[PDB]
Amino acid sequence: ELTQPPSVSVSPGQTARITCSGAPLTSRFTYWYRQKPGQAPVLIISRSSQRSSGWSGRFSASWSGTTVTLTIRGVQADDEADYYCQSSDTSDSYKMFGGGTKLT
């Protein structure tokens, strides 16, 4: 029960923006992962303790208020697939997936 933009397009070699909006964005971070055609998802972003999460793999993410941001790195050449969103609920019970984006 969350919101994600299904289709955003941006210029290659430039920065991009992914959003996922919802209420329980206070209980358990965000997550995303990427879905290549016919392949299993991979960790786009992780959390090892507190702030040191986005950092220097590239990417980086920001959490404004209701919606969060996945400010990705500068180069965007060919790293294109479908992106979702994970996260848990305020009572930790269950997990909701609310679709996600396919960038080109």
Closer to other proteins by CB, 2 or 103: give it: 2
Closer to other proteins by CB, 63 or 97: give it: 63
∠ CA 44-46-23, rounded to 5°: 90
Please give the residue ranges that form the binding site for other proteins (CB under 8 A). Answer: 26, 29, 50-51, 63
Measured from the CB of residue 77, what is the shortest distance to other proteins in angstroms? 31
Measured from the CB of residue 26, what is the shortest distance to other proteins in angstroms? 7
d(CA 8, CA 100): 10
Give the full edge-to-edge strand order of the sheet including 67-69.
19-21, 67-69, 62-63
Measured from the CB of residue 7, what is the shortest distance to other proteins in angstroms? 29
Closer to other proteins by CB, 53 or 76: give it: 53
